[PDB]
From a paper:
Here, we present 2.5–2.7 Å cryo-electron microscopy structures of [name] and HcKCR2 and of a structure-guided mutant with enhanced K+ selectivity. Structural, electrophysiological, computational, spectroscopic, and biochemical analyses reveal a distinctive mechanism for K+ selectivity; rather than forming the symmetrical filter of canonical K+ channels achieving both selectivity and dehydration, instead, three extracellular-vestibule residues within each monomer form a flexible asymmetric selectivity gate, while a distinct dehydration pathway extends intracellularly.
In contrast, the reason behind the significant enhancement of K+ selectivity we observed in H225 mutations remained unclear, as H225 is not directly involved in the selectivity triad. To address this, we determined the cryo-EM structure of the [name] mutant at 2.7 Å resolution and compared it to WT, initially observing no remarkable differences in the EV. While H225 is not part of the selectivity triad, it interacts weakly with W102 and Y222 due to its proximity. Considering that mutations in H225 might affect stability of the selectivity filter, we conducted additional MD simulations for both WT and [name]. Surprisingly, in simulations of the [name] mutant, Y222 occupies the tight conformation for a greater fraction than in WT simulations; simulations of the H225A mutant (also with greater K+ selectivity) using our homology model revealed the same trend. These results strongly suggest that the selectivity triad in [name] has intrinsic flexibility and that mutation to H225 stabilizes the architecture favoring K+ selectivity. However, a pronounced discrepancy was observed in K+ vs. Li+ permeability between WT and [name] (Erev for WT = −102.8 ± 2.7 mV vs. Erev for [name] = −119.2 ± 2.3 mV; p = 0.0035). The [name] mutant exhibited hyperpolarized Erev compared to WT (-69.6 ± 1.9 mV vs. -82.0 ± 1.9 mV; p = 0.0004) with only slightly decreased photocurrents and comparable kinetics in cultured neurons. Because of these potent loss-of-function properties, we name the [name] mutants of [name] and 2 as KALI-1 and KALI-2 (K+-selectivity Augmented Light-Gated Ion Channels).
Residue numbers in the entry:
A (entry chain A), B (entry chain A), C (entry chain A): 6 to 260
Write the structure that this text describes.
Amino acid sequence: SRPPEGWPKGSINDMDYPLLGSICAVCCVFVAGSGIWMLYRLDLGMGYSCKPYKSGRAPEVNSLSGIICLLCGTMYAAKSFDFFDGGGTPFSLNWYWYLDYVFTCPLLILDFAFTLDLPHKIRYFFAVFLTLWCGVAAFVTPSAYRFAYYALGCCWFTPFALSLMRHVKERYLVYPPKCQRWLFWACVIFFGFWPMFPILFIFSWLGTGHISQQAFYIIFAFLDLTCKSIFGILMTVFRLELEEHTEVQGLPLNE
Amino acid sequence: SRPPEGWPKGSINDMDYPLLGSICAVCCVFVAGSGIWMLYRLDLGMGYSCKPYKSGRAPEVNSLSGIICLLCGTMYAAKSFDFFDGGGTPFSLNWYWYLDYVFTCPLLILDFAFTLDLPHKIRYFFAVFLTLWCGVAAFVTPSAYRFAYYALGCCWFTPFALSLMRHVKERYLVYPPKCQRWLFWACVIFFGFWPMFPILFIFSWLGTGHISQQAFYIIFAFLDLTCKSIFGILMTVFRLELEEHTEVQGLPLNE
Amino acid sequence: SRPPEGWPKGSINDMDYPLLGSICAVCCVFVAGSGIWMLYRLDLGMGYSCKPYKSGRAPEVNSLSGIICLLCGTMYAAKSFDFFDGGGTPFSLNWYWYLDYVFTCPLLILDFAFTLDLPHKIRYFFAVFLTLWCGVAAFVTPSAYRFAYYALGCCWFTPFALSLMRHVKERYLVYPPKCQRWLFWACVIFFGFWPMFPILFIFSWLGTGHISQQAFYIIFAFLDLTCKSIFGILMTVFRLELEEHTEVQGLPLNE
Ligand SMILES: *C/C=C(C)/C=C/C=C(C)/C=C/C1=C(C)CCCC1(C)C
Ligand SMILES: *C/C=C(C)/C=C/C=C(C)/C=C/C1=C(C)CCCC1(C)C
Ligand SMILES: *C/C=C(C)/C=C/C=C(C)/C=C/C1=C(C)CCCC1(C)C
């Protein structure tokens, strides 16, 4: 507890620290486990037939899905320690909302872009990075300028979102049906869930005031499990399907 | 105002926050606009004849000019919000001088090096990054060691500057006359203006004490407009000229 | 001295600041000198016979050894300034243990991996980065959770260490005897000294309490000289030997 006597009663920080700690310890194991599986299955070979790589090693970039999970899992361990130490600790990843995501979100979009061979990899990376930084600023600012920062971040996000939706619909047809399945669910996650983040900001204690900070933590735990683990599992299987088509069976894309 | 009652009268922080806010809001629009133009014109094709790219997309690195402007423009929006909120806000890019430049200056030098194909891209990047960090330290330190940090930064900068001047004069002759024009003005900016930054430090309130902090902000706004926007416009046109020569008209460099 | 009247007598901060300052000023010169030599010798050509590069420039990645030294040397200058200013200064690289290493350690492992062509360059980089971050957290935390953070970091380090040891033994045989000599001493440094860092944490004031913080600084100065300078000199000579074999004399590896 940052205050010597502990958090003032009825403060935004007056939460149920044990439950919070626990939820993150579970989030940690499951995300880290999924990441471990991801890197292990990448090392078996190419496709469901686990065809051996010619160089005897997998492409460097294919490791990102799994790395992102382990980075997230490591951060949720840290976060558990903070909650179990009662909150407001000197190395707290709970304190500055969105700072942890400044390290993962841009990696996620790289993962996605490398997997599909989207254009403008660098533009996409920076767009996400700036959006996340605007969130950090929005949460630490107490004036109304909090919303100036939120709007700046929407200025980045909205073009980014439309641009991506357009690019993805262009590559969708290239791929064979069986790969199209996995990509669709990946898109539901990206186009369905990413917009949830900025909508929660509005209903939080820093907006309308409908959702407490404790609730905010729990919701984000579920959102991170979906946007890192499930997303990574769907990226993995999309590559196994693709490889089976192109490498194991040696067939061409529609292009 | 960081102090509850506000900045002490006659302090370095006793400035004209509205005017400061405004200058940055304008700097923001103009820099962000220029960056937008830069990425748009890159997407039209190759050269003044807008020849279509073979891959149907432009090279990744060519996006840096434009990205650097948008990053700068986003930072000047943030800075506006701080000034209009009266200064000393929790997320202030005005507070720690030179911290914003730790993100742009090294990208600028990469942009320049990729464009000309200078050697030692990594050496050049680190040289700039360290110089900028020495500036950060020089400004936060109140002892005379402030000048120890300044000198350390000159130790990095001075070799870097001479090294670059030598490399650039080697590539200048390679290029055809029409491209040589644009490169010369780019060089005037780099060799004329970059040295201005360290000379202003000496005459600031942290050196001789001739230039107030308010003035320091205004001067830097003009310097950033020149070193990011105009520089980026000159990099853009140099590539359009070069492409017209090599790709549209298919002629060789002197080399 | 961070406290106005200065460090309380008999505090962990009640050290011999002048001696500390001096040790770092020497560490600074020697490391920076070694780095300078490294980049100079790289520019002479390929091998002991200094065969000219075909492109007329050396590979970008070969610069990392030397860059890492100069980055370390610049940081030890900063650290000298802090000690000579008596400690607890606003820009102190002495204050947060392990924060400086968050910038060098991952670069070191990249250097090593590029030199040997180890697989999983990105995995290796992140593994080191996370380990170092866990150290930072372990040192700032005052509860017992300090050890939770230490253990998390061992979870990263231990697999990383075994994985590397396995990969290196696979590449050792590839290389000719004369190169094998240099690689062995590089391995002694990596496998002998890297494990020293986490063992010192246990005997420090934050563990059993056998080694003072002053002593901790001195030990780390010697460890950094070994893990950056000597290591870099051994990487350099390994490349000169390798090049003499493969490029100057045009012979094949065992593979
Ligand atoms: C793993 C975490 C993910 C996928 C997080 C995504 C977060 C966003 C896309 C957040 C968006 C924001 C804005 C568009 C505006 C204000 C700030 C944010 C961060 C809430
Ligand atoms: C867009 C911003 C640019 C181009 C800034 C450039 C800044 C410098 C080259 C500053 C140089 C410095 C030194 C050489 C010594 C002390 C610290 C600085 C940052 C003032
Ligand atoms: C140039 C500096 C080097 C090579 C430093 C290496 C440091 C380590 C490998 C430190 C390891 C740690 C752990 C394994 C656990 C706790 C934290 C550390 C940083 C002491």
